[PDB]
Structure 1
């Protein structure tokens, strides 16, 4: 999660500032492969909800719970990445929706498991890794923006 946040912020800084040679493209296409395969992953790739119930009793439940929080952060960082590539591609917004659906699935699973015991962990109300800069950008784009070149893909 936190590694990826650094990578894509670094990479956004590398796009915007450094270019205005044959290295960053490695990491770009790595990230794009991670996007397409993280999309078509679902829950028995990571053996989640079924084999380990992320329990704060066992070590293996703790392993899978730590893994799920890592996943949720990875989803969010790749959201930021797919947004950062282009000017408002439809396909990249589909990827972002798929990542969020994965993240939101994991959140409503963990919420049931924080609905059996109490909300004593402050680890699902832990930080997002998204920059505040980013979210400001994102919310301006979501609500106020009505530019027809971006509207079809943001709708």
Structure 2
């Protein structure tokens, strides 16, 4: 997760300032293919939720817990990337929504799994891999954007 975060940040900064050489021209299509594969991997390629029950006792439910956190982190980074790429093109935003829908699906799976045991699993609130910067820019673009050219995506 953190790795991908590092990658995203360095790479965006590269495109931003460095250019004004095959690794990054590859990585574009790398993350693209990863994103598309991520959209339509539905938790049974990961073997989650029904094959396992996130048992903090069992080695396997422990593993599930950990894998799931990693997954959600991954998704978050990809959300940042998909947003960053476009000049507000709609297919990527649909992708972001679907990513988030799987993410939230995982979070509420854990709420089902964290509803039963006592509330000392405060590891669910594991900090997001979104920069302060991106979040500022996101709310800026949600609430104070009336620009029709972008607005079809923001709606």
TM-score range, shorter chain: over 0.9
**What root-mean-square deviation, in Å, do the aligned CA atoms of Structure 1 and Structure 2 show?**
0.8
Partner deviation per Cα, 1:1-60 (whole Å, 9 max, x = no partner): 111111111111011111113220111110000010000110111110111111111111
Gaps of at least 5 residues in structure 1 are none
- Following the alignment from structure 2 to structure 1, what is the Cα–Cα distance between the partners of residues 151 and 96? 16
Q: Indicate the residue corresponding to 2:132 in structure 1.
A: 132
Q: Which runs of 5+ in 2 are unaligned?
A: none
Partners of 2:106 and 2:130 in 1: CA distance: 18
Deviation string, structure 1 residues 75-131 (Cα, Å, up to 9, x no partner): 000000101111101011011001000100000000111001122022111100100
TM-score by length of 2: 0.97
Matches of 2:52 and 2:40, distance apart in 1: 21
* Equivalent-residue separation in structure 2 for 1:137 and 1:29 (angstroms): 25
Equivalent-residue separation in structure 1 for 2:129 and 2:48 (angstroms): 22
Moved over 3 A (4+): none
TM-score by length of 1: 0.97
Structure 2: distance between partners of 1:136 and 1:39? 26
CA distance in 2, matches of 1:85, 1:133: 15
